[PDB]
């Protein structure tokens, strides 16, 4: 039954299984500034945190995401004959997984893939982004019609996200469409605008009841963060915690546990890419991710707040988003508080004085080489007269705080715009990456060089600078000279 093949594919949304969770949510994810991997895997500083991962670590994401999406996508496509809600969901789920992988490594095979064949040619990034928008539009057309009939009973049997409600999936799909549009908006401003405006007309998420969570954690009924955190190999990141400490942010107790290393209490994150080789036992009593504290908590996929912040940015760009930037900014902040059951958004949004906090690492002796001066001075209260760069940093900083824990949002927005100002490693261990800009992408995998050699070598020439490097920019990322 085709609907049953969707269940495996659905692991791309949140990656609940403990190793999927580590690979996607707790490794390179530290480049988004919210989580820190506290382990070194006997590699010392030759790890993601210092921009010089092993081949095995680098290649994990490809294997994980490809493993969930294929061959199930083609099996569904064939069984359904490219029609119906189950096919629409297979398309949406493939796009979700592959937009993540494209946002990691750049070119991927997509348009030219055929059922069971390894040697697929790569699409360049323009081609795969456009192809993914096309498939997503097809899914949207199907879901929009399906939604008019009420909850879909085929989809209900297997859908832990929305229990078959195609109206919720339609909002999810349009919000993804808008995320994608914003992501490619630097390199293709007019194509992006068109897609974003379509997405807004289609209908994006508007309330907390619209947010997507993997409610069963992939049928495991316990989340992967709690497992990784228990090892321990993941803690709260110095960067997000420091921004939130500076803001006296009331979401702190919903996001993190207080450190218990010393009697001081308070929230203290771990510097990713620390002065000393990261050791699990050293950081065991620093702030943990709240979601790790109760294994039954469902891993998040996408929050209603993100749709508001995407529209705020679109409004800053001069796009027609159904509202102005201020309105969407404040909406986003209030949705984020609401999502986590936190009070006090009014007085938070009135804060014109508080600035992002500096980071000190005083819990363990000899750690002051981890201390960091926050390069942001952005305040919370909306200022109609601020310059463009300040309005953007304000939007993207609150967006980044709101979309938590999200492995990619921070790193993607930083690579695209320079905001939020994610704390870099103390040093780079890669000759092609500097701490100013960090790691820019993951590389193509060893398995592809070995088994799909001619096509992966061709894909190298599709990269911005023709080099399969950690420091090579993706098509949509801001380049060294500020252009796209
Ligand atoms: Cl394991
Ligand atoms: Cl370790
Ligand atoms: Cl396949
Ligand atoms: Cl159809
Ligand atoms: Cl039905
Ligand atoms: Cl364009
Ligand atoms: Cl628990
Ligand atoms: Cl490299």
UniProtKB/TrEMBL annotation:
What InterPro entries has UniProt attached to this entry? SusD-like, TPR-like_helical_dom_sf
Q: Where is the signal peptide?
A: none
Sorted alphabetically, which Pfam families does this protein's record hold? SusD-like (PF12741)
Which parts form a coiled-coil structure per UniProt? Answer: none
Check the record and name the Gene3D superfamilies matching this protein.
1.25.40.390
**This protein is called what?**
SusD homolog
Q: Which organism is it from?
A: Bacteroides thetaiotaomicron (strain ATCC 29148 / DSM 2079 / JCM 5827 / CCUG 10774 / NCTC 10582 / VPI-5482 / E50)
């Amino acid at each position: 039954p085709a609907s049953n093949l969707l269940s495996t594919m659905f692991n791309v949304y949140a990656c609940p299984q403990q190793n999927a969770c580590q690979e996607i949510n707790c490794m390179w994810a530290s480049f988004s500034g919210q989580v820190t991997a506290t382990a070194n895997w006997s590699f010392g500083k030759n790890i993601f945190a210092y921009y010089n991962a092993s081949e095995g670590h680098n290649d994990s994401s490809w294997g994980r995401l490809y493993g969930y999406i294929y061959p199930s996508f083609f099996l569904v496509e064939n069984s359904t004959e490219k029609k119906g809600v189950i096919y629409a969901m297979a398309q949406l789920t493939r796009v979700y997984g592959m937009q993540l992988l494209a946002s990691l490594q750049g070119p991927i095979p997509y348009t030219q893939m055929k059922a069971g064949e390894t040697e697929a040619p790569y699409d360049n990034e323009q081609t795969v982004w456009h192809a993914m928008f096309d498939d997503l539009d097809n899914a949207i057309t199907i879901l929009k019609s399906a939604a008019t009939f009420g909850v879909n009973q085929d989809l209900a049997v297997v859908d832990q996200f929305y229990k078959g409600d195609c109206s919720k999936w339609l909002k999810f799909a349009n919000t993804l469409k808008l995320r994608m549009a914003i992501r490619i908006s630097g390199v293709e401003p007019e194509y992006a605008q068109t897609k974003a405006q379509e997405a807004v007309l289609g209908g994006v998420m508007e309330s907390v009841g619209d947010s997507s969570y993997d409610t069963t954690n992939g049928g495991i009924n316990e989340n992967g963060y709690a497992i990784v955190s228990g090892w321990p190999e993941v803690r709260a990141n110095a960067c997000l915690v420091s921004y939130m400490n500076g803001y006296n942010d009331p979401r702190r107790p919903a996001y993190f546990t207080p450190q218990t290393q010393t009697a001081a209490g308070g929230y203290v994150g771990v510097r990713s890419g620390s002065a000393e080789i990261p050791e699990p036992t050293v950081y065991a009593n620093y702030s943990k991710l709240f979601i790790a504290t109760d294994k039954t908590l469902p891993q998040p996929v996408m929050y209603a707040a993100e749709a508001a912040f995407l529209r705020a940015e679109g409004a800053l760009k001069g796009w027609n988003m159904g509202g102005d930037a201020k309105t969407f900014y404040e909406k986003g902040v209030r949705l984020s508080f609401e999502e986590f059951g936190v009070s006090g958004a009014d007085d938070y949004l009135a804060d014109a004085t508080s600035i992002p906090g500096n980071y000190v690492d005083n819990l363990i002796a000899g750690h002051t080489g981890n201390n960091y001066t926050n390069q942001s001075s952005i305040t919370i209260k909306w200022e109609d007269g601020a310059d463009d760069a300040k309005k953007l940093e304000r939007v993207l900083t609150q967006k980044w705080i709101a979309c938590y824990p999200d492995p990619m949002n921070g790193w993607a927005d930083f690579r695209r715009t320079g905001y939020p100002r994610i704390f870099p490693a103390t040093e780079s261990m890669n000759a092609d990456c500097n701490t100013g800009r960090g790691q820019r992408r993951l590389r193509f995998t060893r398995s592809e060089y070995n088994n799909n050699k001619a096509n992966v070598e061709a894909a190298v020439s599709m990269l911005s600078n023709g080099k399969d490097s950690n420091g090579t920019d993706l098509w949509w990322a801001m380049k060294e000279n500020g252009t796209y």
